Design a protein around this ligand. Structure first.
Ligand code: SF4
Length: 54
């Protein structure tokens, strides 16, 4: 598999985008990890280049 972006390049943030958070993006890594963000993660975050994209 290929690499994801890093959190600041992916536009990670401090509170959710409506219904979308670190858990309702697409491929957040349960229970407490990601692939775009260096883990452990804030579930309230979200990013603009979330894992599970192309
Ligand atoms: S991949 Fe998902 S859980 Fe991780 S920073 Fe982006 S929105 Fe958050």
């Amino acid at each position: 598999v290929t690499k994801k972006a890093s959190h600041k390049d992916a536009g990670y943030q401090e509170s959710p985008n409506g219904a979308k958070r670190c858990g309702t993006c697409r491929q957040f890594r349960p229970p407490s990890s990601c692939i775009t963000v260096e883990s452990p993660i804030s579930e309230n975050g979200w990013c603009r280049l979330y894992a599970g994209k192309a």
